[PDB]
Amino acid sequence: PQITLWQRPLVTIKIGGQLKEALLDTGADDTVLEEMSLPGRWKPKMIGGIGGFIKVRQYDQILIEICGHKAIGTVLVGPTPVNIIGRNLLTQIGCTLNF
Amino acid sequence: PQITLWQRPLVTIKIGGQLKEALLDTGADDTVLEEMSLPGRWKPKMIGGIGGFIKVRQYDQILIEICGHKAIGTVLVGPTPVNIIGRNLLTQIGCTLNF
Numbered sequence: 279p280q281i282t283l284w285q286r287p288l289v290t291i292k293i294g295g296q297l298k299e300a301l302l303d304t305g306a307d308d309t310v311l312e313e314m315s316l317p318g319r320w321k322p323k324m325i326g327g328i329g330g331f332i333k334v335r336q337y338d339q340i341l342i343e344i345c346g347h348k349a350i351g352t353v354l355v356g357p358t359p360v361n362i363i364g365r366n367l368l369t370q371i372g373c374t375l376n377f
Numbered sequence: 378p379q380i381t382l383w384q385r386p387l388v389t390i391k392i393g394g395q396l397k398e399a400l401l402d403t404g405a406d407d408t409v410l411e412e413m414s415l416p417g418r419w420k421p422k423m424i425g426g427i428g429g430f431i432k433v434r435q436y437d438q439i440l441i442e443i444c445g446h447k448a449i450g451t452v453l454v455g456p457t458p459v460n461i462i463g464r465n466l467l468t469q470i471g472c473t474l475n476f
């Protein structure tokens with residue numbers, strides 16, 4: 279599909295059997311979701327953006343479905359104000375910016 | 378042009394007769410640039426990012442060229458980690474997300 283930017287580009291994603299709303303964020307290097315339980319071991323990581331850094335848990339090889347498109351990649355979990363789908367997964371679904 | 382996301386979507390912008398590099402960020406509602414001097418009066422604004430909020434200066438009706446496309450809109454100036462072109466200006470240049 280083609281998504282305009284008049285409003286925030288929010289989409290439904292499926293992860294860990296749960297349906298969640300997330301933002302397609304080209305300004306985010308990685309994907310970070312609000313606190314939730316994921317399987318496997320994780321590594322602590324610090325990510326920074328506007329306002330500073332937050333500590334998140336890094337999970338690798340996580341399967342996520344974005345608008346029906348399956349993608350695998352690293353998913354960070356932490357106190358993010360909104361679920362963010364970053365470039366690491368946007369590339370997997372073939373998302374591009376066009377103008 | 379069509380921009381993939383394997384790397385950060387950085388583009389050259391021209392503002393105040395100077396060239397700067399900025400990130401095309403669909404996750405940013407507004408456009409915020411690193412500390413610089415702009416003409417006119419400014420109004421205060423608080424923007425919240427992944428790590429919290431920062432205070433910025435809001436300038437209106439500012440001319441800014443993005444990848445050769447001329448836009449005139451609101452530009453925020455403050456302690457942002459990188460120059461960000463947000464949805465307010467992305468819409469002016471007709472930028473869309475596609476996949």
Ligand SMILES: O=C(N[C@H]1c2ccccc2C[C@H]1O)[C@H](OCc1ccc(F)cc1F)[C@H](O)[C@@H](O)[C@@H](OCc1ccc(F)cc1F)C(=O)N[C@H]1c2ccccc2C[C@H]1O
Nearest residue numbers: 305306307308325327328359404405406407424426427458
């Ligand atoms: O922190 C970032 N990347 C980092 C990141 C993110 C996830 C995982 C990893 C990493 C590392 C970086 O790429 C990005 O910022 C640019 C940025 C880029 C590279 C870098 F180096 C530092 C840096 F700041 C960030 O994901 C933005 O795309 C966006 O996040 C989603 C979001 C939306 C609504 C909201 F209410 C709160 C939110 F957070 C955001 O902060 N939006 C806010 C904004 C920005 C400018 C002007 C106004 C407003 C209001 C609101 O939309």
